[PDB]
Design a protein around this ligand. Structure first.
Ligand code: MH2
Ligand code: MH2
Lengths: 205, 205
């Protein structure tokens, strides 16, 4: 079964950029709820219940017809939030092989940032913006609700290994930013954990 | 040119059910943004710009290809919130012809409320739950993001003339209910404007 993961920091570690009350709520309520609803759906699927969530969401089409939606949504939610927390940290510097590949695939870091901001802002309703690795090339993609590019193009409309990503569901920014998702997106650059993105790139490039 | 409609009541007129702080942010920030972004997209379209928003969303297939998405999203937002505000009021009662119609089509009011509650809760991500009139038969449906049944099935996945509706985007309930959407859905019964729903049923158009 799944559990709510412990975090790489206290809820206040991303201040003054991301507010600690949202961090706490986001973890103990929203993420906890995906874990709980996934666990309920997995109760009758002992074979699938053993998989890592990040693997299960690559295998949705193998589930029973009546379980696919609820696990796409909840396992997706669990996988995406588990990744998200790892990708937040202050004080990092984009550098090394990851910086070089971003420059290569988008022309410059600023270009990538503009493209990422645009995908994040233009995702209408709930969803995520991502930096994915598609074989030998990095790309910016977005998905709806709790879909993940790990689910594949057919299900999610995107594909690739997520290097990093931004939650743009309203619960992630309402308290501090209300409807100003662009302001939230700007603050994200101060807490993007480039060290984690770098480690993930190193594992997969 | 669209304009943000003033509300038919003060921001605290739906207390203690729907919280006044949310009403003001919802109206003056979120709905304002749909008005502004729709207007922006319509400036180059004099043949569409001055039509009633509820007319525009019936003719999205008539638009230029590059305009269909932005106006589906923002004209739908404007149309939907305009309905919503008028479709909220304390001190009304489900009764008369509409009450009898609902009993006819759903078996009883409680059956209907259960179905509405179910559709409102099961809309994963952002969206709306609706009571619609599909040629003389009332139905419960929901849509994603700012889609409206008035847009038709191909676009919105639903159809029929909206009688009333509930906004289940997170911003509508985050401050007072956080992630507890079933709790917000229960409170909606205390503020749904059954008089305006009855007038709309009466008109059937
Ligand atoms: O989606 Mn948090
Ligand atoms: O969706 Mn207000």
């Amino acid at each position: 079964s799944y559990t709510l993961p412990s975090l790489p920091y206290a809820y206040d570690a991303l201040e003054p950029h991301f507010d600690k009350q949202t961090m706490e709520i986001h973890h103990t309520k929203h993420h906890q709820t995906y874990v709980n609803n996934a666990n309920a759906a997995l109760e009758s699927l002992p074979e699938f219940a053993n998989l890592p969530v990040e693997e299960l969401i690559t295998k949705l089409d193998q589930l029973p017809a009546d379980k696919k939606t609820v696990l796409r949504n909840n396992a997706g939610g669990h996988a995406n939030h588990s990744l998200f927390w790892k990708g937040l940290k202050k004080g990092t510097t984009l550098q090394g092989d990851l910086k070089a590949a971003i420059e290569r695939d988008f022309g410059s870091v600023d270009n990538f940032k503009a493209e990422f901001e645009k995908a994040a802002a233009s995702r209408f309703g709930s969803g995520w913006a991502w930096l994915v690795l598609k074989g030998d090339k990095l790309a910016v993609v977005s998905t709806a609700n709790q879909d993940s590019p790990l689910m594949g193009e057919a299900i999610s409309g995107a594909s690739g290994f997520p290097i990093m990503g931004l939650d743009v569901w309203e619960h992630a920014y309402f308290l501090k930013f209300q409807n100003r998702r662009p302001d939230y997106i700007k603050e994200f650059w101060n807490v993007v954990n480039w060290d984690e993105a770098a480690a993930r790139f190193a594992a997969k490039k």
